[PDB]
Structure 1
Amino acid sequence: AAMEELQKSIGHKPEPTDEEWELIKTVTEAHVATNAQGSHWKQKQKFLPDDIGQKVDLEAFSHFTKIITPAITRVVDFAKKLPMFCELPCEDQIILLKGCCMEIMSLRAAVRYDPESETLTLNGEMAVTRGQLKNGGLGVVSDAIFDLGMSLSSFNLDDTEVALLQAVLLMSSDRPGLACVERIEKYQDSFLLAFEHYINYRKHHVTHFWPKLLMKVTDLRMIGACHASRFLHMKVECPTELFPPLFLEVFED
Structure 2
Amino acid sequence: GHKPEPTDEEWELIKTVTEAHVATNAQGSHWKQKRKFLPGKVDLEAFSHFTKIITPAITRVVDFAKKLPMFCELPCEDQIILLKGCCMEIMSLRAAVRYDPESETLTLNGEMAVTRGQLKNGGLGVVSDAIFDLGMSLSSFNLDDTEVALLQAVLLMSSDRPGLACVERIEKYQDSFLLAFEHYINYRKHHVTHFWPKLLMKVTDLRMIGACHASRFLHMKVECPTELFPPLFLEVFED
TM-score between the two structures when normalised by the length of structure 1: 0.91
- Equivalent-residue separation in structure 2 for 1:134 and 1:100 (angstroms): 21
Query: Structure 1: how far apart are the matches of 2:104 and 2:126?
Result: 17
The structural deviation recorded for 1:40 is 3.8
Residues matched between the structures, number: 238
In structure 1, how many angstroms separate the alpha carbons of the residues matched to 2:32 and 2:76?
41
Aligned mates of 1:38, 1:181 — CA distance in 2: 32
SS for the counterpart of 1:152 is helix
Contact 1:56 1:237 in 2 (8 A): no
RMSD: 1.3
How much does 1:104 deviate? 0.2
2:31–2:107 CA contact under 8 A, matched in 1: no
Alignment equivalent of 2:86, drawn from 81, 100, 116: 100
Other-structure match for 1:113: 99
- Report what 1:216 is aligned to: 202
Deviations 1:114-142 (A, max 9, x none): 00000000000001110100001110000
Deviation at 1:42, TM superposition (A): 4.8
CA contact (8 A) 1:112 1:121 kept: yes
Secondary structure at 1:46 match in 2: coil
What is the deviation of 1:239?
4.0
Deviation of 1:236 (Å)? 4.1
How far residue 60 of structure 1 moved from its aligned partner, in angstroms, is 1.9
Distance 1:178 1:41, change over 3 A: closer
**Residue in structure 1 matching 2:135, options 132, 149, 156:** 149
CA contact (8 A) 2:31 2:111 kept: no
Q: Match for 1:19 among 5, 9, 14?
A: 9
What is the rounded CA distance, in whole Å, between the counterparts of 1:91 and 1:208 in structure 2? 38
1:45 maps to what in 2?
35
Give the gaps of 5 or more residues in structure 1: 1-10, 50-54
Task: State the Cα distance separating 1:237 from its structure 2 match.
Answer: 4.9
CA distance in 2, matches of 1:48, 1:164: 32
SS, match of residue 19 in structure 1: helix
Pick aligned residue for 1:159 from 138, 142, 145: 145
1:46-125 maps to which residues of 2 (within 5 A)?
46-49=36-39, 56-125=42-111
Give CA-to-partner distance per residue, 1:87-129, whole Å, 9 cap, x none: 1011000000000000000000000000000000000000111
Q: Is the 8 A contact 1:137 1:234 kept in 2?
A: no
Q: Shift of residue 57 of structure 1?
A: 2.5
- Alpha carbons of structure 1 residues 116 and 43: separation in structure 2 relative to 1, 3 Å: farther
Larger radius of gyration: 1
Cα deviation, 1:163-222, whole Å, max 9, x if unaligned, reads 000000000000001000000000000000000000000010110000010001100000
Offset, 1:238: 4.5
- After TM superposition, the structure 1 stretch with the greater mean CA deviation from structure 2, 39-48 or 109-118, is 39-48
* Contact 1:164/1:195 (8 A) holds in 2: yes
1:235 Cα deviation from its structure 2 partner: 3.0
Q: More deviation in 22-31 or 236-245?
A: 236-245
Contact 2:5 2:187 in 1 (8 A): yes
Percentage identity across paired residues of the two chains = 100
- Is the contact made by 2:31 and 2:110 (CA closer than 8 Å) also made in structure 1? no
User: What does 1:176-195 correspond to in 2, within 5 Å?
Assistant: 176-195=162-181
